[PDB]
Amino acid sequence: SPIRRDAFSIIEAEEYNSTNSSTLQVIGTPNNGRGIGYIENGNTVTYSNIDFGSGATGFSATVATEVNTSIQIRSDSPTGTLLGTLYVSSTGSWNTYNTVSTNISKITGVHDIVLVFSGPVNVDNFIFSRSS
Numbered sequence: 001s002p003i004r005r006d007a008f009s010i011i012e013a014e015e016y017n018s019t020n021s022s023t024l025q026v027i028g029t030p031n032n033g034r035g036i037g038y039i040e041n042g043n044t045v046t047y048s049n050i051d052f053g054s055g056a057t058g059f060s061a062t063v064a065t066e067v068n069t070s071i072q073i074r075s076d077s078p079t080g081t082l083l084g085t086l087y088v089s090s091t092g093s094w095n096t097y098n099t100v101s102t103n104i105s106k107i108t109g110v111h112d113i114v115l116v117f118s119g120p121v122n123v124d125n126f127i128f129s130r131s132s
């Protein structure tokens, strides 16, 4: 998976750098994309060296799930700064994807990003939004 990435271009969830998960799989999506799934509560997924430049204050992800779930966005490590939490309610099926966004605290410079999952969700991709 790439050693570094730009916060303001699509990041593919399946191109993660490390995970604690023993269940996570790379899955297909309806339009022959890929994502991650078979995620459980407590699972973390790390993406290395994301460059936020002069700042990001939002997070958007394209996700599918049948259960209300939440995803913490942390900087640097699983115990690093909580940037925000994305609350995801059911999208209607494991294959019905929805872009869902949340606010985060302004982050600048280069940081690993850790997604922390409270339960099952399929994730295709994500991207950050620049501060104003």
Ligand SMILES: O[C@@H]1[C@@H](O)[C@H](O[C@@H]2CO[C@@H](O[C@@H]3CO[C@@H](O[C@@H]4CO[C@@H](O)[C@H](O)[C@H]4O)[C@H](O)[C@H]3O)[C@H](O)[C@H]2O)OC[C@H]1O
Binding pocket: 027, 028, 029, 030, 031, 032, 036, 037, 038, 039, 094, 095, 120, 121, 122
């Ligand atoms: O070609 C594409 C197929 O690859 C794709 O397959 C889908 C792959 O993802 C699957 O999503 C799974 C569904 O099960 C979830 O686990 C459930 C979580 O809740 C629990 O209560 C329950 O016991 C578990 O079974 C898992 O988290 C999730 O990733 C999806 O079902 C497949 O259809 O489909 C699109 C094709 O074009």
Ligand SMILES: [Ca+2]
Binding pocket: 012, 013, 014, 033, 034, 035, 123, 124, 125
């Ligand atoms: Ca993807």
Ligand code: NA
Binding pocket: 020, 021, 022
């Ligand atoms: Na394992």
